[PDB]
Design a protein around this ligand. Structure first.
Ligand SMILES: Nc1ncnc2c1ncn2[C@@H]1O[C@H](COP(=O)(O)OP(=O)(O)O)[C@@H](O)[C@H]1O
Ligand SMILES: [Mg+2]
Lengths: 316, 370
């Protein structure tokens, strides 16, 4: 794969099966995800009713940024009391499904998309508040610099979403900026990750992708994040900044932009792994070139004729 | 009525005397098509002027017939004045007297040919040609001040006290919006954005007008741009491809404060206003420091009145207050001052009359314009 899926593939396939199934069997399935996230899928009272529950170490921060309001808006009547050891939960009853295969499919998709929906609330808070600041700056363009300066501190979201990544973001009247305070702790991934983070920033300087968010990189923090608690300028973090401008979160594009920015460091981590398989095929191709330099030391002798199983042959 | 025309190096402002704003504002441009032309009957035209040249610019060589405040192509200026009266303002110049407008320390022949074309081509009943910056005093309701005027072609300073100008203290600087547009093309190239044609010159002029501003402290904004995420701005080109710029937004206008950015050996606009005040008589300087008028479109950058108030209070003594008079209307204040002067009830003896020209030739202008 060149790109990661945004949704949990197991939850999508399992719900696409059970929403079609003539005879649902029971399930009891803990399922891992990226960034230390985990799901429990089960039928805890009837084979008819599936409980899907999410566990996520940053969920208490995400609730401060309007997450429960967005999850109630997305999942509606299916929202359920949290399961013990899990932060959020949804109950789907297999006799209560939508009347069409296409509504069933987009519900199986919506429930598989749950990790990126819980994590989308700080981005929707930034996009909707940028629209307020945009309207105020359109009212008085000479007051806008002070609105942007106060929103840079009063409307900043930080999410410590895993112990080696902090995502920091804020609205200003024409943009959302998001900074990945980013690190690789495994030493070969830190070495290959320096090449990946360098070529990522240099790619944005080429003519072909000027349509993309502005990207910046350093390894001290961007000025407006230097005093956010848990950011630290000597602690081997690099800081990838994306400036999303109004064109990157236009109404036709908000949800794809959110899905795609959250998976940034996951695509980089995955491709640092997949680059090793590429280097290994690059290596064994020129092991096969060096074979031909040793084969010229073999003196030329005809081998006896052999059948496909290696048994000796007696003709010609 | 009289008519008021401000013959801008970049932008014509034209209208009736006694109106509160120009009727016509349009590019001081003539466009000639540079490609072959292949569809007969489809309304091809041999040259284009103003907004029509600006609108069709992709197939055109655009030329400005005024540069550094002097007319360098008189044939194209006859086209711009013809377009001004007949196409844009909808008037016969045969029956309306015209206030024209001119920069200080121009060539004498610029004044002469400008009066000659008005009488011998446009047949005007009478005309005048006012110094561009003393009109900007009239617009502000004021008889004392030093005015910085910076349009597209020139920056100039005139000190005036109780309605009397100090002509030895007048000084001119061949650096304004044109040179800032050329330097923005120069420094957009280092982000990878090559703009080369005289049509792309107008795209960079629009990037300058939309994105540029002046730093209150240049080295502090250069340090802020080293963590650039707040100063980066995107702009979309006519083709829908985009550029993103950071320190180019304030490095461009800083050429007004540091002309050495374009290799020019001259004082910046702050030091040139101070040098013009210090050329004046000692007891008038207090009232000029208090009355620094800003005018013309190159004074429209965000932050420029604050940067000017700062950098003059750093040159001047602390014993008197300095304030910058930068109205929101200041793009048109030269034309507004001409609308006042051409309607003002004691000005009607000061016109150069057609018979008064016919008696003397175009040298008549020097003995009554200034
Ligand atoms: N908002 C602005 N910000 C910066 N530069 C401006 C702005 N508006 C206009 N300009 C500059 O001012 C020039 C026109 O100013 P103007 O006073 O009309 O000059 P001129 O009379 O000499 O033609 C433009 O061509 C451009 O360089
Ligand atoms: Mg001008």
């Amino acid at each position: 794969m060149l790109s990661l899926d945004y949704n949990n593939i197991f939850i999508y396939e399992l719900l696409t099966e059970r929403f079609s199934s003539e005879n649902p069997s029971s399930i009891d399935q803990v399922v891992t995800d990226f960034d230390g996230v985990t799901f429990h899928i089960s039928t805890p009272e009837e084979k008819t009713k599936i409980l899907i529950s999410l566990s996520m170490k940053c969920y208490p921060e995400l609730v401060n940024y309007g997450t429960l309001d967005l999850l109630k808006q997305i999942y509606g009547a299916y929202v359920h009391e949290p399961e013990m050891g899990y932060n959020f939960s949804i109950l789907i009853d297999l006799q209560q499904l939508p009347a069409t295969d296409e509504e069933k499919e987009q519900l199986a998709m919506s429930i598989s998309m749950l990790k990126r929906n819980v994590l989308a609330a700080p981005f929707h808070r930034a996009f909707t508040k940028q629209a307020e600041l945009a309207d105020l700056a359109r009212k008085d363009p000479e007051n806008a610099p002070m609105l942007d300066k106060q929103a840079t501190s009063q409307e900043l979201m930080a999410i410590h979403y895993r112990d080696e990544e902090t995502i920091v973001l804020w609205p200003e009247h024409d943009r959302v900026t998001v900074v990945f305070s980013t690190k690789f702790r495994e030493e070969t991934d830190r070495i290959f990750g320096k090449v990946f983070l360098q070529e990522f920033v240099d790619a944005r300087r080429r003519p072909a992708i000027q349509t993309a968010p502005q990207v910046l990189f350093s390894y001290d923090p961007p000025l407006e994040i230097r005093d956010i608690q848990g950011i630290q300028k000597g602690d081997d973090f690099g800081f990838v900044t994306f400036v999303l401008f109004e064109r990157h979160f236009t109404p036709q594009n908000r949800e794809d932009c959110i899905s795609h920015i959250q998976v940034f460091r996951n695509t980089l981590h995955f491709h640092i792994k997949a680059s090793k398989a590429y280097m290994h095929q690059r290596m064994r191709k020129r092991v096969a070139d060096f074979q031909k330099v040793l084969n010229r030391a073999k003196p030329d002798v005809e081998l006896e004729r052999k059948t496909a199983t290696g048994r000796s042959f007696v003709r010609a | 009525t009289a008519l008021v025309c401000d013959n801008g190096s970049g932008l014509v402002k034209a209208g009736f005397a006694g109106d509160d704003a120009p009727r016509a504002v349009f590019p001081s441009i003539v466009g000639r098509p540079r490609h072959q032309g292949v569809m007969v009957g489809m309304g091809q035209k041999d040259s284009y002027v103003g907004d029509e040249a600006q609108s069709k610019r992709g197939i055109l060589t655009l030329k400005y017939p005024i540069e550094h405040g002097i007319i360098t192509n008189w044939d194209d200026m006859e086209k711009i004045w013809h377009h001004t009266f007949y196409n844009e303002l909808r008037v016969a110049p045969e029956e309306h007297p015209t206030l024209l407008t001119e920069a200080p320390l121009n060539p004498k022949a610029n004044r002469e040919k400008m009066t000659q074309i008005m009488f011998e081509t446009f047949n005007v009943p009478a005309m005048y040609v006012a110094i561009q910056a003393v009109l900007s005093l009239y617009a502000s309701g004021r008889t004392t001040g030093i005015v910085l005027d910076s349009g597209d072609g020139v920056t100039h300073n005139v000190p005036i006290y109780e309605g009397y100008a100090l002509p030895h203290a007048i000084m001119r600087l061949d650096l304004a919006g044109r040179d800032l547009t050329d330097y923005l093309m120069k420094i957009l190239t280092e982000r990878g954005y090559s703009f080369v044609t005289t049509a792309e010159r107008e795209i960079v002029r629009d990037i300058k007008e939309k994105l540029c501003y002046v730093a209150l402290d240049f080295e502090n904004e250069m340090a802020t741009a080293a963590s650039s995420s707040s100063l980066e701005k995107s702009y979309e080109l006519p083709d829908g491809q985009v550029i993103t710029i950071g320190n180019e937004r304030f490095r461009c206008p800083e050429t007004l404060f540091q002309p050495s950015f374009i290799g020019m050996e001259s004082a910046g606009i702050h030091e040139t206003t101070y040098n013009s005040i210090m050329k004046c008589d000692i007891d008038i300087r207090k009232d000029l420091y208090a009355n620094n008028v800003m005018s013309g479109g190159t004074t429209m950058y965000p932050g420029i009145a604050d940067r000017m108030q700062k950098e003059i209070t750093a040159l001047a003594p602390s014993t008197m207050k300095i304030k910058i008079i930068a109205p929101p209307e200041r793009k048109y204040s030269v034309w507004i001052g001409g609308s006042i002067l051409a309607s003002l009830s004691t000005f009607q003896q000061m016109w150069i009359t057609k018979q008064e020209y016919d008696e003397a030739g175009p040298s008549i202008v020097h003995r009554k314009c200034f």
